[PDB]
Design a protein around this ligand. Structure first.
Ligand SMILES: CCCCCCCC(=O)OC[C@H](COP(=O)(O)O[C@@H]1[C@H](O)[C@H](O)[C@@H](OP(=O)(O)O)[C@H](OP(=O)(O)O)[C@H]1O)OC(=O)CCCCCCC
Ligand code: NA
Lengths: 527, 136, 76
């Protein structure tokens, strides 16, 4: 079961001996046997090597160009080019699979991709290999986008072909050239709208598990597309949403600031203008809360996170949902004749005013600043808080054990007194109900030297280091955050670009249009 | 009078080191203080509104008084017990601790870090701008 | 209006063919025509290339040293 399925063709191809391959092919051995052994499976154990489960794929994935030429140009039994393995992957799918983002590996993978594409055009002009979709329902371009294969995606999105009867395969073109400036056209077929899966939505909605999700959008055409769509309509839509949220928060603040404070809600409606306005404001605030609650529900239903990216991705969505939950609990408590509705609503109010920071995206500098805040909270504050809490609790317990009796004989009071040192308000004499003054002073001085002088300054230093280290990463994360905003704005409910002619004739008689997107560049050398 | 005493700083040009220092002040004011002030004002206003809504009555039942009390934390003079006219002490303490952790411990130190980065990045630009200021 | 004003001299200079330039100059075509087309204007749209609106300037601005030598040393 482990090695089962292998045939002598596989061994001959592996050892890289042309003479033996030809001699074995003389007998007529089938060249379509699939090796289903677990060693040839994807990840069934640490030992193994996935190559597509066919001799053609094995040759393609192991620096065997002459061998694949032979297999595709042998009279006894020509090798099929569209063959699909058990997983559904073809030769191009396997080539995408074996890519691992290394300079030599990327160079070889792209070279073999191009060569096989040209050969397939030559033997089978009608057939188009780029549309063959594996059993997972993904084309090789979609597979490259999902898997994080930056090199393959970059090569595919902007390939050019300059040979007879196979120029139609190219994706970038050149509309015209004049002097040092020439205009190039990029094919937007299945990048922004595909109705099943496209490069943009595959990259944006990919889980955090994918390796290069941040760097994937830096490929030229994608950045140009995102900026174009933004400037076209998304900027105005986003500004309107930001304005509406500001108005909603202002209304909520005004309504909460003027609560009637009389005891045991609900409260009656006094016949006055101010009371009517207050009732209207609170109704509007509750409406906003329920709207956000429903939005969060449908987001969770649609994206359906893996139950672990919830704590790693979609922080904004969970924060907005928690705000809505606080508002709804506040309403329920209010109509149940309880005063804790005030506590719930103040928590919701503070959460909403902080969530105001979400709209910081859409402005480059402020977006970078917010991304930096998010990183800092995740790393530095967490580690600092763990160590600081340990120290504070230990020294608080020691001090409160020392004290005999009085106001500060409780753990909470002494913990608060010890914490006051951190904010520049420590007393050093807040009590005298102890038997030993030297022990008290030594404990307090040790706590001060350990936290205030050491840990806070080290936190400043580590923050400086992190700030030094995460600039480009912050910019890339901001770009991804804006791309997600653009895609969501489109989906909530514009087109790619102008239709144009590039080849004028496919291999067949009829011509084709492929929804191109123009880019202009200037060159001063290589005339 | 205050504006004139601050404008005294214009004549700092004509001396190389002090001119560079003033140019750095100008850059810092333009970038770092502006971004920090926007975010800080948002946080301060939000938490002030929450706290003042919590309070029932008394001296600190006004938005201005509570905003000033919250601001005092930034300058190392926050009280953490400035009032008691509320129904829930846990909510009050949680709000104040959240505000402190979010501003005093996080944002101020991040501002120091970003100031350090900017200082690292703008030396030659500051010297060139000083040269242009002297040429004018 | 877009491409208007261009003459065969401009195309000959652009393609960088000395033989055709000389042959065309044999007929005596004027070497002072100004291309006023919007493509040749400064920034009238994203497409365009400003070069001064003269064959001499076009040669000077496009790595044509032999061409400008010829235009400045032609007897006709
Ligand atoms: C305990 C609180 C936890 C929530 C706070 C978490 C700390 C914080 O600052 O909020 C972040 C949130 C932005 O989060 P948002 O989900 O939209 O942006 C994504 C987030 O950074 C995820 O980590 C990733 O998701 P994915 O890959 O695309 O799928 C990706 O970045 P990366 O990691 O991959 O590089 C980003 O796309 O900002 C706010 O709106 C609230 C205002 C800040 C107020 C903060 C007050 C808490
Ligand atoms: Na102090």
């Amino acid at each position: 079961s482990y090695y089962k399925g292998q045939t002598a063709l596989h061994i001959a191809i592996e050892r890289r001996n042309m003479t033996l391959v030809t001699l074995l092919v003389e007998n007529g051995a089938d060249v379509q046997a699939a090796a289903n052994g677990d060693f040839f499976k994807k990840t069934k154990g640490r030992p193994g090597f996935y190559f597509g489960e066919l001799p053609l794929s094995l040759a393609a994935c192991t620096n065997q160009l002459a061998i694949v030429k032979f297999l595709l140009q042998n009279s006894w039994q020509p090798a099929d080019i569209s063959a699909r393995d058990s997983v559904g992957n073809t030769v191009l799918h396997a080539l995408v699979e074996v890519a691992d983002n290394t300079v030599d590996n990327t160079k070889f993978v792209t070279s073999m991709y191009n060569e096989i594409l040209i050969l397939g055009a030559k033997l089978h002009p009608t057939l188009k290999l780029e549309e063959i979709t594996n059993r997972k329902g993904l084309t090789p371009l979609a597979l490259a986008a999902s898997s994080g294969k930056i090199g393959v995606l970059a090569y595919i999105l902007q390939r050019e072909i300059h040979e007879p009867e196979c120029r139609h395969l190219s994706r970038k073109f050149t509309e015209w050239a004049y002097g040092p400036v020439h205009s190039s056209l990029y094919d937007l077929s299945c990048i922004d709208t595909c109705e099943k899966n496209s490069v943009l939505e595959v990259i944006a909605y990919s889980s955090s598990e994918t390796p290069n999700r941040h760097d994937m959008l830096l490929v030229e055409p994608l950045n140009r597309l995102l900026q174009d769509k933004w400037d076209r309509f998304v900027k105005r839509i986003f500004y309107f949403n930001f304005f509406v949220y500001c108005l909603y928060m202002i209304i909520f603040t005004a309504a909460a600031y003027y609560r009637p404070v009389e005891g045991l809600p609900p409260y009656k409606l006094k016949n006055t203008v101010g009371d009517y306005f207050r009732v209207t404001g609170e109704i509007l605030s509750v409406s906003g809360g329920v709207y956000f609650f429903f939005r969060g529900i449908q987001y969770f239903l649609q994206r359906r996170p893996s139950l672990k990216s919830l704590f790693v991705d979609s922080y904004s969505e969970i924060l907005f949902f928690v705000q809505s939950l606080f508002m709804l609990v506040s309403v329920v408590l209010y109509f149940s004749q309880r005063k804790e509705y005030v506590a719930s609503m103040v928590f919701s109010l503070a959460m909403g005013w902080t969530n105001m920071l979400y709209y910081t995206r859409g402005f480059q500098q402020m977006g970078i600043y917010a991304v930096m805040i998010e990183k800092m909270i995740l790393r530095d504050l967490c580690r600092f808080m763990f160590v600081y809490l340990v120290f504070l609790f230990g020294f608080s317990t020691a001090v409160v054990t020392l004290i005999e009796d009085g106001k500060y004989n409780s753990l909470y009071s002494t913990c608060l007194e010890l914490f006051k040192f951190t904010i520049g308000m420590g007393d050093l004499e807040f009590t005298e109900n102890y038997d030993f003054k030297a022990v008290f002073i030594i404990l307090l001085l040790a706590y001060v030297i350990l936290t205030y002088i050491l840990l806070l300054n080290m936190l400043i230093a580590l923050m400086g280091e992190t700030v030094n280290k995460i600039a480009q990463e912050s910019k890339n994360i901001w770009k991804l955050q804006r791309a997600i905003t653009i895609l969501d704005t489109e989906k909530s409910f514009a087109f790619r670009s102008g239709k144009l002619l590039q080849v004028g004739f496919t291999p067949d008689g009829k011509d084709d249009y492929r929804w191109c997107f123009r880019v202009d560049e200037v060159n001063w050398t290589t005339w």
